[PDB]
């Protein structure tokens, strides 16, 4: 259902139950062959740990930025909230976010 990306020391969570209307492929994208179901931060994938790095190797980049070939966590949440200001706050705000729990 909803996992916590914490191999050792790092809080966060993704509930597969609240995202049932999205195709698995949108997130688990087809790369250099087929759809890979491995963790996003493995060796040879998104392992770069510097936030100024905007290449496809960046970790902070693929989770927070807006201009990308595949929609990011923040990228898709903006379209979903639309004109509801109270809801845009809850899904894209930095302070006290449910994404970092
Ligand atoms: C579609 C119904 C769907 C499938 C299938 C799928 C599978 C899947 C697996 C096997 C894992 C576990 C990997 C592990 O052992 O850590 C997993 C994990 C994550 N998923 Fe997923 N997933 C499906 C759907 C979705 C959707 C639509 C998204 C994006 C909103 C998504 C995202 C992720 C993420 C992030 C993880 C966590 C990986 C981690 O680093 O812990 N999944 N999924
Ligand atoms: C884990 C479910 C996962 C996420 C989340 C994710 C996101 C993601 C984005 C948003 C991009 C766009 C980058 C850009 O600058 O436009 C992107 C691109 C690539 N990814 Fe990825 N990705 C996830 C997982 C994986 C895994 C497991 C690997 C390693 C096999 C991987 C690799 C790549 C590569 C390569 C690209 C670029 C592909 C291209 O068209 O050149 N991703 N990912
Ligand atoms: C990126 C890996 C990512 C994370 C992390 C994430 C988290 C997240 C949370 C915590 C919620 C809030 C649920 C709650 O209130 O308990 C949530 C909800 C929605 N999301 Fe999401 N989400 C991530 C990725 C994505 C992507 C890429 C999309 C779109 C393709 C997406 C969509 C949604 C939708 C829909 C919701 C529901 C909003 C509602 O009206 O309840 N998320 N996400
Ligand atoms: C608001 C734009 C915002 C900020 C700023 C922010 C910061 C932040 C940091 C510094 C990290 C740690 C990076 C590292 O590698 O050490 C981090 C991690 C994650 N975030 Fe975030 N974040 C902000 C907002 C959001 C929102 C609204 C979401 C969900 C839609 C989101 C998601 C994530 C995810 C996933 C991670 C990785 C979690 C992990 O593996 O520990 N952030 N964020």
From Swiss-Prot:
Subcellular location as annotated: Periplasm
Positions annotated to bind heme c 4: 64, 94, 99-100
Binding-site positions, heme c 1: 16, 24, 27-28
Chain segments annotated as coiled-coil in the UniProt record: none
GO cellular component: periplasmic space
Predominant cellular place of this UniProt entry's protein: periplasm
Membrane-spanning residues: none
MF terms in GO: electron transfer activity; heme binding; metal ion binding
GO biological process, one term: anaerobic respiration
Domain of life per record: Bacteria
Binding positions (heme c 2): 29, 40, 45-46
Binding site for heme c 3: 19, 73, 76-77
Keywords, in A-Z order: Electron transport, Heme, Iron, Metal-binding, Periplasm, Signal, Sulfate respiration, Transport
PTM (free text): Binds 4 heme c groups per subunit.
General remark: The second and fourth heme binding sites have unusual CXXXXCH motifs.
Primary role: Participates in sulfate respiration coupled with phosphorylation by transferring electrons from the enzyme dehydrogenase to ferredoxin.
Protein name in UniProt: Cytochrome c3
Provenance organism: Nitratidesulfovibrio vulgaris (strain ATCC 29579 / DSM 644 / CCUG 34227 / NCIMB 8303 / VKM B-1760 / Hildenborough) (Desulfovibrio vulgaris)
Residues of the full protein shown: 29 to 129 of 129
């Amino acid at each position: 259902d909803g996992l916590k990306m914490e191999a050792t020391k790092q809080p966060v969570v993704l509930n597969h139950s609240t995202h049932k209307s999205v195709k698995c492929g949108d997130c688990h994208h087809p790369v250099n062959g087929k759809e890979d179901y491995r963790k996003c931060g493995t060796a040879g994938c998104h392992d770069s740990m510097d936030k100024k790095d905007k290449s496809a190797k960046g970790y902070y980049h693929v989770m927070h930025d807006k201009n990308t070939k595949f929609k990011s966590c923040v990228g898709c949440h903006v379209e979903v909230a639309g004109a509801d200001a109270a809801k845009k706050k809850d899904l894209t705000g930095c302070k006290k976010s449910k994404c970092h729990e």
